[PDB]
């Protein structure tokens, strides 16, 4: 609510996520950090523009509340600044689904994440139609729900021409397939999938 939270006024620390299964070097590469404000420990994601200039945080508490730290745009993807080329991206849905694929692929293939979810994906896909003309394929990795299939069917409309391929999961989404040991499936569903 206040500003971009400086780390010095929030006692910034980069560590792992033991309940989720993500190391410290992945969270160091992305920007996902842990702060101590008002006593209660808060996890906080760190957005940037395409240049790399810091404009927004997003804070979740011990029971997953939402705390936005300013003007939350629609042309801001989680980790958009990290990649400016390549041949494939894996558009996830949450923010730990981005970290999980950066863990299971060792920061090699580009992975970006959306800052709204399945509520306004089209709003942040049609307004991000100009970022995707520097890649070659798009592998949509959404939730395996009614809302996930609805979001991928409505979001396969305002993406670029015919490059969209949709990967399927046996879990709810990617992090439970990481926790239950299904690291063999999501390494195949990135490489091949069933199209529109």
């Amino acid at each position: 609510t206040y500003n971009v939270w400086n780390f010095g006024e929030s006692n910034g620390r980069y560590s792992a996520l033991t309940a989720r299964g993500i190391s410290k070097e992945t969270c160091q590469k992305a920007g996902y950090w842990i702060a101590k404000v008002d006593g209660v420990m808060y996890q906080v994601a760190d957005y940037r523009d395409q240049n790399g200039n810091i404009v927004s945080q997003k804070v979740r508490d011990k029971d997953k509340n939402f705390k936005t730290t300013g003007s939350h745009k629609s042309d801001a993807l989680f980790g958009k600044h990290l990649w400016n080329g390549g041949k494939k991206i894996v558009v996830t849905e949450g923010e730990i689904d981005m970290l999980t694929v950066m863990e299971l692929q060792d920061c090699k293939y580009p992975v970006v994440s959306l800052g709204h979810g399945a509520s306004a994906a089209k709003k942040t896909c049609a307004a991000n139609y100009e970022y995707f003309d520097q890649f070659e394929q798009i592998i949509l990795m959404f939730d395996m729900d009614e809302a996930g299939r609805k979001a991928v069917e409505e979001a396969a409309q305002v993406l670029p021409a015919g490059k969209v391929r949709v990967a399927v999961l046996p879990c709810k989404d990617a992090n439970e397939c990481h926790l239950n040991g299904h690291d063999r499936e999501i390494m195949e569903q990135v490489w091949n999938a069933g199209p529109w």
Binding site: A19, D63, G181
Partner: protein, 645 residues
């Protein structure tokens, strides 16, 4: 000989997933670890160690660890996997017989242990006692989640696999190995002429004592009958609860109008406190201020109040003379409710989905080898002589298990031994009076003719009195059994001491064997010991707690072991006769209280075969140890555990 440790997701009641496992070997010295995807390799390593003729060392392996593997290997990858019971050994069943006394030696060490681990045979407590403990998984995981910030939900941290689980599993198998070396570093049970880390399953079992073999067989069988359960009727105990919960809510309405309220001193602050019959202070106050003198002072300023002084109490007001009986009935109904349905360990809070009760049975919990029963205690439900007793034992039946192939109920057989410790007495003192006492026990019933000779009202009172006299009473506690004074409490002692003058000679023999000097203090006792232990029937060092209970720990510790071998032999004959144990076979054990057994079987002919072969098993027990008496049992047949008492 390998030492292997498991880690899975939950308890044996509901387990579906394997997480990790570590194996150490005594021939290659290798911490061969495994992963969640290497469960087939884990089972192949264990089956190779079985097939070459070795021993697998678990910890708490008979109860949890081996049937967890048999459940996971079926319902995760569809393969049968059974370990033969002469290959798996445990290091908790060994600890419960070698270190059978931790509460009396654990003081002086509590400086090491936290305080919650005082007298615990768990694997972490021996990690604190061996001074080899590097952290704890639950505390470090809770601290790590408080350090990230995500909450700690339910105390369930075996959901997801990680690396700290494997690390503390490696430390777990370190603690198991360091316990096994000390447990095999004992000389009274394991002779120091052979190394027990390379011998087979025909040398390890039969080149040592018999108490190391009978205890593992007993732990195997009691874990199996724990996995079977006890069939239980829920509707017939909810009817009882709705019956006698509308009686203690009438015995307080009818009673607070008789015994009125009063002001109690909390400028003098007072409170309007009312009569609570469950308290033994309010009844004491209201009986003092209504004209009653106790004439019995256990406490230094307060009387004693129980069922034997609430009978012999008289007051002037003839309303209170009727009210005291309602007070006693209210205390009875309160205890029955708190045992049956409202307690923290009630019966209706330990009924599974399939309508059965699973209670833990520790095979060696007492110092004298007597099993203890817990969670819930199925050894102390009310008998058929107490009020509301048959209605509580008629729910614990074996006819409440309708068959899964024909839809028919089963039959129950119950077998009790007769005159067990009283006949072990005639075994032990037959070298003094030349065996002219062990002939009258075999000539007719003992307790009935003892009741005739002592003019007691009931056989139960004669049976209480004879053991009360035998296990070193005083002048008054066997006069209290008949209600009379210490004059009759002296003449009964003289009458049953001058009949057979060998009990005092046996007691003098035990005193000359164990104790050598006992200095007297006017408020205490200072004794220099010579042998604190007694060799039992199979070489086990039975610990003697007090020098006037030596006859007790000589009789009941030799009486428990013949029942412990009897319950093993009466299935070793039934499986070899051509039957099948379990619910999907022909018979199943249900409960083993201190003397009798309860078995439930499919047809009446199988009941008759079991009730025949129990006699042959008991006679083989009586022949294997060369008793000077002749052991004998008695069996009954019925639908539930009210006729089969």
């Amino acid at each position: 000989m390998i030492v292997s440790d498991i880690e899975a997701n939950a308890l044996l009641e509901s387990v579906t997933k394997f997480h990790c496992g570590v194996i150490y070997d005594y021939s290659t010295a290798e911490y061969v670890s495994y992963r969640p995807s290497d469960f087939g390799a884990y089972l192949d390593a264990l089956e190779a160690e079985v097939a070459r003729g070795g021993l697998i060392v678990f910890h708490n392996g008979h109860k949890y660890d081996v049937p967890a593997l048999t459940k996971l290997a079926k319902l995760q990858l569809n393969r049968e996997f059974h370990l033969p019971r002469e290959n798996c050994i445990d290091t908790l069943v060994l600890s419960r017989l070698i270190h059978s006394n931790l509460k009396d030696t654990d003081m002086g060490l509590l400086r090491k242990l936290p305080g919650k681990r005082f007298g615990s045979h768990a694997l972490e407590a021996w990690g604190y006692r061996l001074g080899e403990m590097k952290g704890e998984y639950k505390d470090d995981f809770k601290r790590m989640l408080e350090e990230q910030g995500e909450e700690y939900v339910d105390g369930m941290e075996w959901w997801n696999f990680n690396e700290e689980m494997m690390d503390y599993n490696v430390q777990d198998v370190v603690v198991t190995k360091a316990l096994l070396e000390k447990l095999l570093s004992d000389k009274h049970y394991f002779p120091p002429e052979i190394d027990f880390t390379d011998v087979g399953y025909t040398t390890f079992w039969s080149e040592s004592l018999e108490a190391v073999d009978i205890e593992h067989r007993a732990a195997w069988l009691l874990a199996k009958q724990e996995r079977n359960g006890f069939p239980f009727d829920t509707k017939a105990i909810e009817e009882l609860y709705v019956e006698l919960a509308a009686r203690r809510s009438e015995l307080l309405r009818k009673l607070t109008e008789t015994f009125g309220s009063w002001y109690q001193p909390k400028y003098t602050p007072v409170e309007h406190v009312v009569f609570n019959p469950s308290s033994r202070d309010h009844i004491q106050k209201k009986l003092q201020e209504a004209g009653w003198v106790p004439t019995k002072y256990t406490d230094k300023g307060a009387p004693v109040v129980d069922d034997e002084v609430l009978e012999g109490v008289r007051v002037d007001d003839p309303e209170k003379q009727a009210a005291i009986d309602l007070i006693k009935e209210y205390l009875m109904i309160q205890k029955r409710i708190g045992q049956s349905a409202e307690g923290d360990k009630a019966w209706l809070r330990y009924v599974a989905e399939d309508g059965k009760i699973h209670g833990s049975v520790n095979p060696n919990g007492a110092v004298t080898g007597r099993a203890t029963h817990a969670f819930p205690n199925l050894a102390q439900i009310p008998g058929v002589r107490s009020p509301y007793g048959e209605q509580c034992r008629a729910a614990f039946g074996a006819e409440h298990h309708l068959d899964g192939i024909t839809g028919k109920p089963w039959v129950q057989a119950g077998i009790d031994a007769s005159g067990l410790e009283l006949r072990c007495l005639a075994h032990f003192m037959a070298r003094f009076d030349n065996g002219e006492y062990a002939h009258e026990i075999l000539n007719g019933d003992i307790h009935t003719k003892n009741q005739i000779a002592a003019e007691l009202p009931t056989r139960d009172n004669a049976k209480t009195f004879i053991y009360g006299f035998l296990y070193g009473a005083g002048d008054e506690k066997i006069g209290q059994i008949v209600g009379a004074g210490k004059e009759r409490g002296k003449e009964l002692k003289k009458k049953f001491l001058e009949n057979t003058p060998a009990i005092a000679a046996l007691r003098e023999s035990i005193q000359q064997t164990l104790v050598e000097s006992s200095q007297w203090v006017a408020g205490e006792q200072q004794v220099k010991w010579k042998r604190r232990w007694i060799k039992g029937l199979d070489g086990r060092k039975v610990h003697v707690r007090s020098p006037h209970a030596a006859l007790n720990t000589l009789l009941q510790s030799a009486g428990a072991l013949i029942c412990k071998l009897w319950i093993i032999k009466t299935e070793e004959m039934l499986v070899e006769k051509g039957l099948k144990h379990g619910w999907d076979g022909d018979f199943a054990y249900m409960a083993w209280v201190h003397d009798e057994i309860q078995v439930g079987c499919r047809t009446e002919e199988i009941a008759q075969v079991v009730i025949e072969t129990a006699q042959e098993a008991m006679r083989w027990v009586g022949d294997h140890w060369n008793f000077r008496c002749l052991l004998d049992t008695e069996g009954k047949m019925g639908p539930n555990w009210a006729i089969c008492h």
